[PDB]
Design a protein around this ligand. Structure first.
Ligand SMILES: Nc1ncnc2c1ncn2[C@@H]1O[C@H](COP(=O)(O)OP(=O)(O)O)[C@@H](O)[C@H]1O
Ligand SMILES: Nc1ncnc2c1ncn2[C@@H]1O[C@H](CSCC[C@H](N)C(=O)O)[C@@H](O)[C@H]1O
Lengths: 200, 416
């Protein structure tokens, strides 16, 4: 297991344990770094004492980042990730200023009162990112929820048609905008990784 | 003909190498034949040969133990020949590699060596390093002495004896790319000669350099000459060798490299065959692909702006690289190493004829003028082929010291 340090604008370091062995959510992906670093931007701020749900949390990278900015966040992923999520919470407990807790949530199922933000990073990549994920997103989301989706535009085999359909379905219940590349973190940004905003 | 290309073993036994049956017919070799194998640095090994259906005819399957014994890598070339008269050894002297027995106690012979040699009739050579798995830990052992003088077959009567525990290139060797060499020398001078001037000046140093090209263009040579002549530690990663290991064995490899590059900084980490490690694979939900790229991107983002560790990696297919490598200023410089033109070949041929006594009649530019799709590797082979034909000519003078190589010897080499 190898540890990503994720440096914060204020100097503290998030440390995410990663496993070269498990499923895809056992390493930090670059959409995670992009999203995390974007939450830290001046034009963003504003997470303090707010309700954050993270889907596809995997390593916990983004949810943990939000937990250190003052939010009350629930990091959710499949049963296989709960022990990593918990290990990574323990790794960073000393920096959580709001609150964080690990829960199981498989998309297309149900488990509150609607959350302020919903954060996703690199969740749109296979069959379950389609009908099941939008079910969960259509459910949890109130009308004043700000869902923020971060993902890497991929070009190989089954990935581009999942990304195509996923926006062909998002129009059914949701309005979306893509935030320009220059509002991303100055250094941790890339022409092929997209931060997009959702409402309704 | 008896020169073969080293491939991965499916038959992961130490004592076994595999060829295709058509190849085994061309050498008149049969299953269970003891064979002698020759590799690099004058290293030799004694194995049993077997058939294998899934094996290109020009290749030999051999496990990692034998490859290390021959000092050779995947894609390299070994020789094979019959070894008929391997007699049964009377007593062997064997010790364990200290790296592998640290912090273990027990009857080393009962746990490891007895069940390893037992009724197997293994061929062994003095100086072999063998690994014996099983036993809560895999220990590697070394053959220090045999009872036949070299070679032996460890038969039941053989008695086993065990006590103790055992343990420069430069710029003038690179031809045909005097431009691209200066372009790398320049990417790397400031970060390896004046690291701290990057915080001071306030500028982001290079972390990764991609060298593109076809096999044989000398990309490993370039990197090692950059490291030896700027005073930099050098750590080689071979793509398919690290991928050949178990996930976890390679994760230990990859970590070790960055550990040692920083323990010896300024250092250059060189990754031969980047696409063996970081393909442009698709991505779906599975446990089935190992996450080596992420380990590597994690170790490289962790180096940050210290600038004392530079990572160079080479590939034959640039559009076949995981795009994650080219973002956040990881691999954001790329130099191209192509076939040399006519002047480039001549540059290379003077380098490879450097310690060969050349005839008066030798016109190295004519050789150059007739070597088109040739890369430095082919020009090297062409020179050794010519000196080999010089040696075979003095060999025929047993019709009853040193050597001298003529243009005829080269004319033989240009005609394969
Ligand atoms: N441009 C060159 N100048 C001098 N020697 C070369 C050159 N290209 C290849 N060689 C010879 O070929 C050998 C292997 O080249 P290598 O560094 O493995 O290239 P690559 O990494 O592109 O496959 C070198 O050790 C050297 O003997
Ligand atoms: N149907 C589903 N329900 C819940 N989680 C899922 C899911 N399908 C995939 N996942 C999770 O989705 C995540 C996508 S991998 C991305 C992990 C994280 N965004 C990071 O960048 O580090 C994985 O952690 C996987 O465990």
């Amino acid at each position: 297991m190898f540890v990503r340090v994720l440096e914060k604008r204020d100097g503290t370091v998030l440390r995410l344990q990663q496993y070269s062995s498990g499923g895809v959510g056992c390493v930090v992906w670059d959409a995670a770094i992009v999203l995390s670093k974007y939450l830290e931007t001046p034009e963003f701020s504003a997470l303090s004492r707010r309700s954050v749900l993270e889907l596809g949390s995997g390593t916990g990278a983004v949810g943990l980042m939000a937990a250190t900015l003052g939010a009350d966040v629930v990091v959710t992923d499949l049963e296989e990730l709960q022990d990593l999520l918990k290990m990574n919470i323990n790794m960073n407990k000393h920096l959580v200023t709001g609150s964080v807790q690990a829960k199981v949530l498989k998309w297309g199922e149900e488990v509150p009162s609607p959350p302020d933000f919903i954060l996703m990073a690199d969740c749109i990549y296979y069959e379950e990112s389609l009908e099941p994920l939008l079910k969960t997103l259509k459910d949890i989301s109130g009308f004043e929820t700000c869902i923020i989706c971060c993902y890497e535009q991929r070009t190989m085999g089954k990935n581009p048609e999942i990304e195509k359909k996923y926006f062909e379905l998002l129009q059914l219940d949701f309005d979306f905008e893509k935030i320009p590349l220059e509002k991303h973190d100055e250094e941790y940004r890339s022409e092929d990784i997209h931060i997009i905003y959702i409402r309704k | 003909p008896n020169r073969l290309i080293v491939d991965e073993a499916i038959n992961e036994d130490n004592s076994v190498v595999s060829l295709s049956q058509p190849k085994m017919d061309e050498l008149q070799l049969f299953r269970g034949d003891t064979v002698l194998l020759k590799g690099k640095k004058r290293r030799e090994a004694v194995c049993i040969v077997l058939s294998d259906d899934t094996c290109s005819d020009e290749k030999i399957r051999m496990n990692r133990v034998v490859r290390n014994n021959l000092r050779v890598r995947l894609g390299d070339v070994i020789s094979i020949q019959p070894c008929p008269d391997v007699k049964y050894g009377k007593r062997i002297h064997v010790l364990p590699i200290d790296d592998t027995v640290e912090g273990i106690t027990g009857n080393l012979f009962e746990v490891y060596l007895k069940p390893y040699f037992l009724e197997a009739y293994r061929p062994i050579r003095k100086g072999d390093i063998f690994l014996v798995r099983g036993g809560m830990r895999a220990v590697e052992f070394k053959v220090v002495e045999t009872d036949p003088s070299p070679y032996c077959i460890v038969a039941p009567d053989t008695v086993i004896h065990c006590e103790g525990e055992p343990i420069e290139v430069g710029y003038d060797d690179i031809g045909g790319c005097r431009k691209q060499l200066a372009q790398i020398k320049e990417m790397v001078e400031l970060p390896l000669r004046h690291p701290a001037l990057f915080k001071a000046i306030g500028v982001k140093p290079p972390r990764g350099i991609l060298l593109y090209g076809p096999p044989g263009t000398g990309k490993t040579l370039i990197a090692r000459a950059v490291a030896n002549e700027t005073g930099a530690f050098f750590f080689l990663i071979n793509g398919p060798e690290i991928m050949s290991k178990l996930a976890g064995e390679s994760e230990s490899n990859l970590r070790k490299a960055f550990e040692e590059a920083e323990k010896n900084a300024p250092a250059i980490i060189f990754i031969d065959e980047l696409d063996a490690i970081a393909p442009k694979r698709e991505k779906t939900h599975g446990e089935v692909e190992r996450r080596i790229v992420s380990q590597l991107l994690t170790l490289m983002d962790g180096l940050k702006q210290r600038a004392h560790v530079i990572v160079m990696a080479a590939t034959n297919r640039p559009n076949s690289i995981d795009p994650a490598l080219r973002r956040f200023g990881r691999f954001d410089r790329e130099v191209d190493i192509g076939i040399p033109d006519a002047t480039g070949r001549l540059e290379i041929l003077q380098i490879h004829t450097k310690n060969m006594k050349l005839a008066d009649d030798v016109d190295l530019e004519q050789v150059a003028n007739e070597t088109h799709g040739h890369v430095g590797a082919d020009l090297a082979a062409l020179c050794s082929e010519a000196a080999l034909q010089a040696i075979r000519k003095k060999m025929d003078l047993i019709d009853l010291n040193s050597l001298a190589v003529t243009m005829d010897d080269f004319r033989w080499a240009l005609s394969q």
